[PDB]
Write a structure and sequence with these properties.
homodimer; alpha+beta; Nuclear Transport Factor 2, Chain: A; 6-stranded mixed beta sheet; 3 helices; NTF2-like_dom_sf (chains A, B)
């Protein structure tokens, strides 16, 4: 929707989530993000071990740990370019970069969150570049 | 934002664009979609010949023609799952499928439009699955 207001809980909660997400990417510490996830949290990811639908917070921790495992000094969010929402969902379109075992990884990414009350109940990631550029 | 209203031109225009985009995918006829694009239209795509930033409507036509060339009976939008917006941008998270030279293509996609007046001024595409599943 075009309109927001301080009472837009969906935006507020999603933004808090995206902050902890940023922190997880940069530092490999994911607990603050995980603590914001519902017990029935699901996430969708495009490829590999974590391809498709994943269920629950244990599996989430496994995912996020795995993400950080090869970025020895983390991933940076270079720009957060577009944030869109509706009653329940927020999408963050961003650019990132980090050394993947010392090799330059760069991408365009869209992460979509659903919000339930003061927490996030689902996540979906989409790839917008080739991992070499953004 | 959480809130909308009939005066939400961004949503209105984007939805019209998405209808013409649906039609282009299903039929390979893109004129109606193209007609809604601004002269300074740009589009971002993740890989291949059209990887990165692409500028202008001539190039847009090439791209959309290219998309349709190998889907002899088109691509169907199986579901439109999430539509989010702000003052200027709308993102459509959807599931699609079609025969790619007789071979089953299925995906999760997010396409993001910017709106300017009664037109669309940019496009960004993100992949959410592996082209085999959604």
């Amino acid at each position: 929707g075009m309109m927001t207001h301080y009472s837009d809980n969906t935006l507020k909660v999603a933004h808090q989530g995206f902050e902890f997400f940023t922190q997880g990417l940069a530092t490999g510490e994911w607990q603050k993000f995980l603590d914001m996830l519902t017990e029935d949290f699901t996430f969708w990811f495009p490829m590999g071990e974590f391809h498709g639908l994943n269920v629950g917070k244990e599996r989430a921790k496994e995912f996020f740990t795995y993400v950080s495992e090869s970025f020895h000094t983390g991933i940076q969010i270079s720009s957060l370019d577009r944030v869109t929402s509706n009653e329940t969902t927020v999408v963050f379109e961003f650019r990132d970069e980090g050394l993947f075992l010392g090799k330059p990884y760069k991408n365009r990414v869209a992460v979509s969150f659903d919000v339930r009350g003061d927490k996030i109940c689902s996540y979906r990631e989409y790839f917008g570049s080739d991992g070499k550029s953004n």
